[PDB]
Swiss-Prot record, chain A:
Role played: Mitochondrial membrane ATP synthase (F(1)F(0) ATP synthase or Complex V) produces ATP from ADP in the presence of a proton gradient across the membrane which is generated by electron transport complexes of the respiratory chain. F-type ATPases consist of two structural domains, F(1) - containing the extramembraneous catalytic core, and F(0) - containing the membrane proton channel, linked together by a central stalk and a peripheral stalk. During catalysis, ATP synthesis in the catalytic domain of F(1) is coupled via a rotary mechanism of the central stalk subunits to proton translocation.
Protein's cellular compartments: Mitochondrion; Mitochondrion inner membrane
Entry-annotated residues carrying Phosphoserine: S4
Lineage of source species: Eukaryota, Fungi, Dikarya, Ascomycota, Saccharomycotina
Further information: Present with 12900 molecules/cell in log phase SD medium.
Residues of the full protein shown: 141 to 192 of 244
Name of the protein in question: ATP synthase subunit 4, mitochondrial
Gene that specifies this protein: ATP4
Organism: Saccharomyces cerevisiae (strain ATCC 204508 / S288c) (Baker's yeast)
Signal peptide: none
Subunit annotation: F-type ATPases have 2 components, CF(1) - the catalytic core - and CF(0) - the membrane proton channel. In yeast, the dimeric form of ATP synthase consists of 17 polypeptides: alpha, beta, gamma, delta, epsilon, 4 (B), 5 (OSCP), 6 (A), 8, 9 (C), d, E (Tim11), f, g, h, i/j and k.
Family membership: Belongs to the eukaryotic ATPase B chain family.
Swiss-Prot record, chain B:
Residue numbers bearing the Phosphoserine modification: S101
Role noted for this protein: Mitochondrial membrane ATP synthase (F(1)F(0) ATP synthase or Complex V) produces ATP from ADP in the presence of a proton gradient across the membrane which is generated by electron transport complexes of the respiratory chain. F-type ATPases consist of two structural domains, F(1) - containing the extramembraneous catalytic core, and F(0) - containing the membrane proton channel, linked together by a central stalk and a peripheral stalk. During catalysis, ATP synthesis in the catalytic domain of F(1) is coupled via a rotary mechanism of the central stalk subunits to proton translocation.
Similarity annotation: Belongs to the ATPase alpha/beta chains family.
Protein name per Swiss-Prot or TrEMBL: ATP synthase subunit beta, mitochondrial
Cellular compartments annotated: Mitochondrion; Mitochondrion inner membrane
Subunit structure: F-type ATPases have 2 components, CF(1) - the catalytic core - and CF(0) - the membrane proton channel. CF(1) has five subunits: alpha(3), beta(3), gamma(1), delta(1), epsilon(1). CF(0) has three main subunits: a, b and c.
Whole-protein residues included: 273 to 392 of 511
Note: Present with 164000 molecules/cell in log phase SD medium.
Length: 52, 120
């Protein structure tokens, strides 16, 4: 029983962490949307050149 | 697609569907124009009409026009003269069949019969 309970302690630790970490993920996706816009602008720049 | 390729300098990923309707069409007006059928029921101008068509679709000094063409094999038999002539004209054949599609294996492309002349 002592073994089983110990484990339940750890489940309680790990969910507390996932909130912070998950929150970090959303923040990362925000900067990523700005990265996607650099790809486009860089693509367009290339395109004008090729046509000239 | 030619306009893209040369003057406006852009790759095309052309698609045509079904290109047997093109072969079958030439065969209909072939007999009536006086040009007696050859290869049995087909236009005698099969090689050159194909040939002209295929050469336009290519990569040159600018654009690269890479066509994906549907092709219909009649009677499910691909040792018949109309598909066989075509097999030569196309770079990267695939073969599909009723059996594979029904078996639950999507797509019905066969594993040994899908062959390219662009595979090195």
């Amino acid at each position: 029983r002592i073994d089983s309970v110990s484990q339940l302690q750890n489940v309680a630790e790990t969910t507390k962490v996932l909130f912070d970490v998950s929150k970090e993920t959303v923040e990362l996706e925000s900067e990523a949307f700005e990265l996607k816009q650099k790809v486009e602008l860089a693509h367009e720049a290339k395109a004008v050149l090729d046509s000239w | 697609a030619e306009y893209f390729r040369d003057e406006e300098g852009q790759d095309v990923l052309l698609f045509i569907d079904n290109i047997f309707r093109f072969t079958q069409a030439g065969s209909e007006v072939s007999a009536l124009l006086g040009r007696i059928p050859s290869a049995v029921g087909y236009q005698p101008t099969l090689a050159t009409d194909m040939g002209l068509l295929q050469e336009r679709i290519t990569t040159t000094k600018k654009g690269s026009v890479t066509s994906v063409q549907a092709v219909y094999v009649p009677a499910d038999d691909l040792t018949d003269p109309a598909p066989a002539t075509t097999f030569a004209h196309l770079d990267a054949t695939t073969v599909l069949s009723r059996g594979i599609s029904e078996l639950g294996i999507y797509p019905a492309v066969d594993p040994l019969d899908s062959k390219s002349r662009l595979l090195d």
